Amino acid sequence: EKLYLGMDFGTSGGRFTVIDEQGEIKAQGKREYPPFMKEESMGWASSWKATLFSLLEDIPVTVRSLVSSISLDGTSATTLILNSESGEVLCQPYLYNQSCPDALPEVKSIAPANHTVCSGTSTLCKLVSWWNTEVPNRESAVLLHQADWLLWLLHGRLGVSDYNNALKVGYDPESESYPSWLLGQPYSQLLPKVQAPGTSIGNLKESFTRQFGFPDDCIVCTGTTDSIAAFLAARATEPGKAVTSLGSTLAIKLLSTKRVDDARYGVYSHRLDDKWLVGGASNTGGAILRQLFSDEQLERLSQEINPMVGSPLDYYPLQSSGERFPIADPNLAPRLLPRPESDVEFLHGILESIARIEGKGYKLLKELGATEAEEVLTAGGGAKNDKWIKIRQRVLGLPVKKAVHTEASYGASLLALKGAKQNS
Ligand SMILES: Nc1ncnc2c1ncn2[C@@H]1O[C@H](COP(=O)(O)OP(=O)(O)O)[C@@H](O)[C@H]1O
Numbered sequence: 457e458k459l460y461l462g463m464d465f466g467t468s469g470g471r472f473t474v475i476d477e478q479g480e481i482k483a484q485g486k487r488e489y490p491p492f493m494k495e496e497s498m499g500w501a502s503s504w505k506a507t508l509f510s511l512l513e514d515i516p517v518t519v520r521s522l523v524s525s526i527s528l529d530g531t532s533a534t535t536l537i538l539n540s541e542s543g544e545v546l547c548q549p550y551l552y553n554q555s556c557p558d559a560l561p562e563v564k565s566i567a568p569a570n571h572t573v574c575s576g577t578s579t580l581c582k583l584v585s586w587w588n589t590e591v592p593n594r595e596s597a598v599l600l601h602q603a604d605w606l607l608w609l610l611h612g613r614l615g616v617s618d619y620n621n622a623l624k625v626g627y628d629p630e631s632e633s634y635p636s637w638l639l640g641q642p643y644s645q646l647l648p649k650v651q652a653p654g655t656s657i658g659n660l661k662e663s664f665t666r667q668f669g670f671p672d673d674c675i676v677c678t679g680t681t682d683s684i685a686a687f688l689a690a691r692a693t694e695p696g697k698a699v700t701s702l703g704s705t706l707a708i709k710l711l712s713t714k715r716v717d718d719a720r721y722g723v724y725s726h727r728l729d730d731k732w733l734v735g736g737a738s739n740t741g742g743a744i745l746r747q748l749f750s751d752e753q754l755e756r757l758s759q760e761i762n763p764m765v766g767s768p769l770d771y772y773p774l775q776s777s778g779e780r781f782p783i784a785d786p787n788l789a790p791r792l793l794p795r796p797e798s799d800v801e802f803l804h805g806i807l808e809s810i811a812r813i814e815g816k817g818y819k820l821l822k823e824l825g826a827t828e829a830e831e832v833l834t835a836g837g838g839a840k841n842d843k844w845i846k847i848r849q850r851v852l853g854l855p856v857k858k859a860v861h862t863e864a865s866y867g868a869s870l871l872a873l874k875g876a877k878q879n880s
Pocket residue numbers: 702703704705741742743745746751754755758835836837838840841844
């Protein structure tokens with residue numbers, strides 16, 4: 457009977473998924489963000505709010521009437537500043553990939569060496585940059601991440617975030633606190649309270665129950681970031697489970713009982729339930745595949761590969777030099793020689809070599825302290841290549857399969873379900 461709504465506010469549009477408690481999808485949809493008015497000080501946020509209302513309307517009314525819990529994900533370090541009394545968004549949002557290099561020396565002066573906040577795109581750099589513009593009445597402002605802000609439109613209790621969204625402002629999910637080096641600064645007064653992802657905040661506002669026909673007891677739960685929501689969609693929750701994304705770049709995520717952070721390799725941990733999600737990403741993968749072969753060619757050529765035979769070719773497939781993970785070398789050369797005359801042999805070498813890099817990545821995470829990988833689920837454009845699944849199973853020496861779901865909005869709907877179950 458009861459259903460669970462997840463939404464995903466990504467880089468270009470919004471998506472939703474509604475599930476039952478067994479994870480069966482009852483409704484799903486997508487919308488591109490609409491334009492915003494040039495003069496609108498909310499900027500993109502006005503578009504995001506429009507998309508929230510459009511997505512809600514797109515849910516069939518019979519489905520809305522059963523939705524018991526709502527959660528949503530947004531993009532990492534997309535930062536809004538609001539007045540606490542009026543709710544007015546005080547400036548155009550600082551987007552996930554926007555940088556505030558002006559603030560970075562100040563952040564490096566207060567934060568531990570190589571802390572994740574010490575990057576110009578971090579939420580903290582954005583906060584410090586905004587603070588230092590000396591807006592009148594800045595002491596009455598509050599910071600919200602994109603997901604927090606969209607959820608606050610639904611529940612009307614200002615100022616709450618989650619362990620994942622808050623990592624890039626300096627929140628420590630291991631101690632479940634903001635550290636003293638951050639609390640010692642006056643802009644810390646803008647920081648939101650922080651709860652676990654997928655926990656209840658409060659009931660859905662009456663305006664939404666009245667307008668859209670949600671039940672009066674529908675709750676709204678904290679969310680997460682889009683990258684983590686997409687991982688959650690794989691429904692893997694035990695230490696040693698991993699997801700490889702075979703996308704334009706090769707990104708791996710490993711669930712661990714042990715926290716792992718290493719700036720040499722750009723390795724970072726997020727908290728998930730009572731465990732740690734450990735991630736790293738390589739510049740190999742789909743972008744170099746696409747430079748060499750169309751999608752149609754990859755499918756056709758892969759048909760000719762015998763995935764149980766190893767390629768003798770040692771490649772490091774890259775479009776240009778440089779790697780951070782699993783090799784920390786900004787000058788690391790692409791290696792695609794020798795190139796055999798057979799495109800099938802060439803492709804086999806590339807796919808096998810990317811599997812070696814994937815394996816090397818999981819080995820590194822383990823040597824840095826993570827729970828050793830036991831099973832690898834696969835997402836991204838490369839997941840549909842069953843020959844490559846088999847190549848990877850052989851090279852990794854671990855069971856490999858397709859993740860059953862990979863949409864962030866599906867992962868957000870699992871957080872809605874988590875929060876409902878905890879709330880009952
Ligand atoms: N059969 C295939 N085998 C391996 N890779 C593939 C295959 N088909 C498409 N791709 C690769 O998938 C990449 C796109 O992956 P995707 O996860 O959809 O993209 P993005 O990272 O941009 O979100 C492309 O670079 C493409 O080369």
